[PDB]
Amino acid sequence: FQGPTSFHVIQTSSFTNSTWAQTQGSGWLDDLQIHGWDSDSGTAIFLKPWSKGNFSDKEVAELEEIFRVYIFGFAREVQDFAGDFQMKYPFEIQGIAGCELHSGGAIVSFLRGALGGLDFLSVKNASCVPSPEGGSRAQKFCALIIQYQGIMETVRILLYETCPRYLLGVLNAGKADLQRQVKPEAWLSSGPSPGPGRLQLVCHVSGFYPKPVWVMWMRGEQEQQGTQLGDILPNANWTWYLRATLDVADGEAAGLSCRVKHSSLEGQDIILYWRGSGLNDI
Amino acid sequence: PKIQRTPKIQVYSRHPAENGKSNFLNCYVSGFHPSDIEVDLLKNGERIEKVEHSDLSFSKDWSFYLLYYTEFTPTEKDEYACRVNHVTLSQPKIVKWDRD
Ligand SMILES: *[C@@H]1O[C@H](CO[C@@H]2O[C@@H](C)[C@@H](O)[C@@H](O)[C@@H]2O)[C@@H](O[C@@H]2O[C@H](CO)[C@@H](O[C@@H]3O[C@H](CO[C@H]4O[C@H](CO)[C@@H](O)[C@H](O)[C@@H]4O)[C@@H](O)[C@H](O[C@H]4O[C@H](CO)[C@@H](O)[C@H](O)[C@@H]4O)[C@@H]3O)[C@H](O)[C@H]2NC(C)=O)[C@H](O[C@@H]2O[C@@H](C)[C@@H](O)[C@@H](O)[C@@H]2O)[C@H]1NC(C)=O
Ligand SMILES: *[C@@H]1O[C@H](CO)[C@@H](O[C@@H]2O[C@H](CO)[C@@H](O[C@@H]3O[C@H](CO)[C@@H](O)[C@H](O[C@H]4O[C@H](CO)[C@@H](O)[C@H](O)[C@@H]4O)[C@@H]3O)[C@H](O)[C@H]2NC(C)=O)[C@H](O[C@H]2O[C@H](CO)[C@@H](O)[C@H](O)[C@@H]2O)[C@H]1NC(C)=O
Ligand SMILES: CCCCCCCC/C=C\CCCCCCCC(=O)O[C@@H](COC(=O)CCCCCCCCCCCCCCC)COP(=O)([O-])OCC[N+](C)(C)C
Ligand SMILES: *[C@@H]1O[C@H](CO[C@@H]2O[C@@H](C)[C@@H](O)[C@@H](O)[C@@H]2O)[C@@H](O[C@@H]2O[C@H](CO)[C@@H](O)[C@H](O)[C@H]2NC(C)=O)[C@H](O[C@@H]2O[C@@H](C)[C@@H](O)[C@@H](O)[C@@H]2O)[C@H]1NC(C)=O
Ligand SMILES: [Cl-]
Ligand SMILES: [Cl-]
Ligand SMILES: [Cl-]
Ligand SMILES: [Cl-]
Ligand SMILES: [Cl-]
Ligand SMILES: [Cl-]
Ligand SMILES: [Cl-]
Ligand code: NA
């Protein structure tokens, strides 16, 4: 099946000073957002009609309350211990936790934490593992948190028992959106001149879903190895955008074409032809 | 906890630019830390009123990213830009949309 294969929640907790901290959170299938966190209410925002997967309303409400208590208590404890951990404000903590479906059917879970944009800890084998970037502070943190009865057990249950069934349920519940096929459109433009006597040609591919896509500059049937793939960029409403560039000498632009392949096209590639002398768009 | 990362800023149209035809203007801001950031979309140097944006997310290297977008109708003479403020910047950074 196509589309996302993983679910995760993220946390960004920003500590301005000793009496003011705020947390943002959200839930995701790969890079598609399916849950928001509403700080006005301490409850979640379900962005799709299928965002609860196969979970009952009652279990969903229990999990929302877990997150609400956790978010409040996380700020309370960090602020209480910030002095002992020699913390300087402002600072920012991030967390990600979830699970993913692999080839062969295994589901693997993960939990990672960061401080100051650097890795701080991870959970491996239901244990707290300090990251080397986290230094002695992370060692100190792991030794302290594992003494929290309930937190260790609740994290274990959520990662290894709740997440895998949630993931399968929501991948199934959302398959109409997650496995839909959306065709790209493509067009050609100039790029910034690389320098004297050279041109950059740009092949734009926009509006495709799912994310895997193939784009190449061609001379007839010969793929141009010089093709430079840009980073895939988001559009609103769950589609993607991609630029493929080629730097050529002025007199060598004629004869070039851009070919696009995508799962939605059922084998009918898009072919665009570069024409020189300003004849590139009727 | 100490090195900050400045935002990368990429501005692009949802559809090929056709003058007089409605379109969507995207500004993708990424690679930055910490998360607090101010992003505006500009038309002829003036801030656009109704802009939408994604909830906060971050990449595997912990850098944050956001998508800002709005409807726009390109013309031959009007200009559009993305303007970003961040603690790593002493002044706002402006990246202009350029269909070419
Ligand atoms: C949300 O969906 C989850 C996934 O459901 C499956 O996938 C989706 C896409 C649809 O296709 C569904 O129709 C489909 O069920 C549910 O979780 C899954 O529940 C089933 C039970 O329905 C459960 O199957 C049991 O598995 C155990 C063995 O599990 C161990 O071993 C496997 C490897 O072999 C390992 O992967 C596991 O992690 C465990 O270590 C087995 O003993 C059971 O057999 C018993 O029951 C069967 C009939 O069901 C009977 O024939 C046997 O003779 C015996 O009595 C049974 O096969 C899946 O393992 C489980 N999957 C996961 C990843 O957890 C989920 O169900 C809820 O949670 C379950 C854990 C279970 O407690 C259910 O009763 C719950 O309703 C569902 N709902 C929620 C709320 O999450
Ligand atoms: C994946 O997770 C497994 C489940 O937790 C883990 O197995 C556990 O390993 C523990 C050691 O790391 C072991 O703890 C011991 O428990 C005995 C009583 O049963 C106790 O005597 C002993 O105490 C001593 O050591 C402590 C420090 O370790 C010390 O604080 C204490 O005061 C005293 O000196 C120790 O606590 C668990 O019993 C064990 N549990 C289970 C269910 O297996 C895996 O790690 C170990 O796995 C096997 C055991 O199956 C062992 O051969 C090795 O010790 C592994 O390290 C873990 N996997 C990996 C790869 O780490
Ligand atoms: C529909 C969508 C479904 C989503 C599917 C699920 C996927 C989500 C996947 C993963 C989600 C991971 C969840 C994180 C929160 C779990 C802990 C918690 O919340 O406890 C409570 C807050 O307790 C507190 O207030 C203390 C807060 C201090 C936080 C310290 C940092 C812990 C970092 C971790 C470092 C790892 C250390 C090593 C770990 C082995 C919550 O309130 P409670 O429940 O009412 O009370 C439980 C009582 N107990 C805490 C005693 C148990
Ligand atoms: C601790 O930080 C608080 C919040 O800072 C605000 O939000 C952050 C996200 C960041 O953007 C920051 O720049 C913001 O200012 C302070 O509260 C703020 O205080 C200032 C000015 O004194 C005020 O501008 C803000 O409105 C206010 N934010 C609120 C209330 O949401 C704390 O300052 C104290 O609170 C004030 C209301 C006031 O009584 C003042 O005397 C206090 O110092 C910061 N406290 C400390 C110890 O510095
Ligand atoms: Cl809250
Ligand atoms: Cl410390
Ligand atoms: Cl639980
Ligand atoms: Cl074209
Ligand atoms: Cl080669
Ligand atoms: Cl402008
Ligand atoms: Cl990581
Ligand atoms: Na204090």
Assign 3-class secondary structure to chain A: CCCCCEEEEEEEEEEEECCEEEEEEEEEECCEEEEEEECCCCEEEECCCCCCCCCCHHHHHHHHHHHHHHHHHHHHHHHHHCCCCCCCCCEEEEEEEEEEECCCCCEEEEEEEEECCEEEEEEECCEEEECHHHHHHHHHHHHHHCCCCCHHHHHHHHHHHHHHHHHHHHHHHCHHHHCCCECCEEEEEECCCCCCCEEEEEEEEEEEECCCCEEEEEECCEECCCCEECCCEEECCCEEEEEEEEEEEHHHCCCEEEEEECHHHCCCCEEEECCCCCCCCC
Q: In terms of domains, do A123 and A187 share one? A: no
Is the preceding peptide bond at A234 cis, omega within 30 degrees of 0? no
Q: In terms of domains, do A197 and A156 share one? A: no
Q: Are A236 and B52 inside 8 Å of each other by CB?
A: yes
What count of other Cβ atoms lies within 10 Å of the Cβ of residue A175? 14
In chain B, residues with a C-beta closer than 8 Å to the C-beta of A90 are 34
In chain B, residues with a C-beta closer than 8 Å to the C-beta of A187 are 16
How remote is the C-alpha of B91 from its chain's centroid? Answer: 15
State the Cα–Cα distance between residues B25 and B70, nearest whole angstrom: 5
Q: In terms of domains, do A137 and A187 share one? A: no
Which residue is associated with the tokens 């002493």? B90
Q: Report the separation in Å between the CA atom of A200 and the middle of ligand 9, taken as the mean of its atom positions.
A: 20
**Resolution to 1 decimal, in Å?**
1.7
Q: In terms of domains, do A90 and A158 share one? A: yes
Chain A, chain B: beta-carbon pairs less than 8 Å apart = 80
Which residue is associated with the tokens 């100190």? A140
Q: Angle CA(A75)–CA(A33)–CA(B93) in degrees, nearest 5?
A: 80
**CATH superfamily to which B1-100 belongs:** Immunoglobulins (2.60.40.10)
Ligand 1 within 6 A of CB of A168: yes
State the Cα–Cα distance between residues B59 and B90, nearest whole angstrom: 25
Q: In terms of domains, do A174 and A190 share one? A: no
Q: Angle CA(B69)–CA(B44)–CA(A192) in degrees, nearest 5?
A: 75
Structural domain ending residue among the three candidates A150, A179, A208: A179
State the Cα–Cα distance between residues B72 and B48, nearest whole angstrom: 10
Alpha-carbon torsion (B18, B20, B23, B24), positive or negative: positive
- Six-digit token string for B83: 């303007």
Phi, psi torsion values for A48, nearest 5 degrees: -130, 150
Of A150, A144, A178, A137, which Cα lies nearest the Cα of A53? A178
State the Cα–Cα distance between residues A270 and A281, nearest whole angstrom: 16
Phi, psi torsion values for A164, nearest 5 degrees: -60, -45
List the CATH number of the domain containing A49.
3.30.500.10
Q: What is the CA radius of gyration of chain A?
A: 24
The secondary structure of A221-232, three-state, reads CEECCCCEECCC
Q: Are B67 and A236 inside 8 Å of each other by CB?
A: yes
Q: In terms of domains, do A157 and A274 share one? A: no
Q: In terms of domains, do A127 and A191 share one? A: no
Residue B21 is given by DSSP the state: S
- Six-digit token string for B55: 């909830």
Residue nearest to ligand 4 atom 42, measured at CA: A19
Phi, psi torsion values for A68, nearest 5 degrees: -60, -45
For residue B51, the SS3 value is: coil
State the Cα–Cα distance between residues A108 and A123, nearest whole angstrom: 12
Distance from CA of A53 to the nearest CA of B (A): 21
Chain A contact for B28, CB < 8 A? yes
Domain that residue A241 falls in: 180-282
State the Cα–Cα distance between residues A77 and A24, nearest whole angstrom: 17
CB contact at 8 A, A193 and A133: no
Domains held by chain A: number: 2
Q: In terms of domains, do A16 and A152 share one? A: yes
Of A148, A103, A142, which Cα lies nearest the Cα of A123? A142
Alpha-carbon torsion (A40, B57, A174, A230), positive or negative: positive
Q: Are A28 and B57 inside 8 Å of each other by CB?
A: yes
Q: In terms of domains, do A246 and A171 share one? A: no
